[PDB]
Design a protein around this ligand. Structure first.
Ligand SMILES: C[C@H](CCC(=O)NCC(=O)O)[C@H]1CC[C@H]2[C@@H]3[C@H](O)C[C@@H]4C[C@H](O)CC[C@]4(C)[C@H]3CC[C@]12C
Length: 307
């Protein structure tokens, strides 16, 4: 069964690590950083890894129920028991780091917590409320592997012990934001388990190619970005196809359909990430209609043309 890529321009792709369209291609040496995201992870033959699931709306979202105020915190802080972001119960026994779609980076994540009561007020139906909220993945009480997280709100009174959804919007602040720093999915207890492995180039002169989205920031200065190894569409595609990988590397070419010419080439590794022959930190300048084309199976030590 032949391996394929979907035919998509970068304006038609979705970030697999934060709910946002892809804004640009991006590359970096990432010298003293371990690139090990848990969302957006899928082998070329369709094996999901880490905390990766299929629905873009579930990425960095939470669903569950607020059960109490955080102990010894009389204001602004809520204990939220979480399920899988698709309402299904969460089994901590499974070899995953967290409920699928849980954020895979340290940050104060800004969004909205919304509640629909699970009972009716007479003929009117259930009551509702929604407020600005923060999920600090840096908190010791961020323990999604154990089924609970801390949620902070500016509202201190209008929150009930009721079914709750967290819709992510962006970052609250730049402080403690590191997109390559994995959260302690079990807080101060044990360590992280079920992880997708770190990815890195193994051939000299190569760097990882990222699909980058710039995400909102509630205050302060900065231009925070989320890089993913694979767009969500490729993950959904590989999962459907499950095409066997003939080698460890698929040779892909970025093609301009207007001129028909190849602009650059990259190595799509079996583990689900791209390397290119390029040095430096910055965007890859590309035309609007360009797309990736799968051309050949090659070896781990294939030499790419420098770009
Ligand atoms: C308690 C948590 C996280 C604390 C932390 O980083 N480490 C301590 C720990 O290990 O829990 C903090 C981090 C950011 C805080 C929020 C943000 O500062 C924004 C906001 C500021 C308002 O003055 C109070 C509510 C509100 C919404 C804060 C509530 C408490 C939060 C959610």
């Amino acid at each position: 069964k032949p391996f394929t890529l979907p035919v998509l321009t970068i304006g038609e792709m979705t970030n697999s690590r934060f709910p946002a369209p892809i804004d640009m291609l991006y590359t970096s040496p990432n010298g003293n950083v371990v690139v090990q995201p848990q969302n957006g992870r899928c082998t070329l033959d369709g094996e999901l890894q880490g905390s990766t699931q299929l629905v873009p709306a579930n990425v960095c979202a939470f669903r569950g129920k607020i059960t109490a105020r955080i102990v010894d915190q009389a204001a602004h802080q809520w204990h939220m028991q979480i399920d899988n972001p698709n309402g299904t119960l969460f089994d901590p026994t499974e070899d995953v780091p967290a409920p699928l779609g849980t954020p895979d980076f340290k940050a104060k994540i800004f969004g909205v917590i919304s509640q629909r009561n699970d009972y009716n007020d007479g003929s009117q139906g259930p009551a509702n409320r929604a407020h600005d909220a923060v999920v600090p993945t840096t908190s010791a009480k961020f323990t999604p592997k154990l089924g609970s997280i801390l949620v902070g709100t500016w509202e201190n009174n209008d929150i009930e012990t009721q079914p709750s959804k967290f819709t992510p919007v962006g970052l609250l602040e730049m402080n403690d934001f590191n997109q390559w720093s994995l959260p302690n999915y079990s807080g101060a207890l044990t360590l992280n388990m079920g992880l997708a492995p770190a990815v890195f180039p193994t051939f000299p002169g190569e760097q990882i190619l990222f699909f980058r989205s710039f995400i909102p920031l509630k205050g302060g200065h900065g231009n925070p970005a989320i890089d993913c190894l694979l767009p969500q569409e490729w993950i959904q595609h590989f999962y459907q196809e499950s095409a066997p990988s003939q080698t460890s590397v698929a040779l892909i070419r970025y093609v301009n359909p207007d001129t028909g010419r190849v602009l650059f080439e990259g190595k799509l590794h079996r583990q689900g990430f791209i390397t290119i022959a390029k040095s430096g930190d910055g965007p890859i300048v590309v035309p609007p209609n360009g797309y990736f084309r799968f051309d050949s199976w090659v070896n781990q030590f294939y030499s790419l043309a420098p770009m």
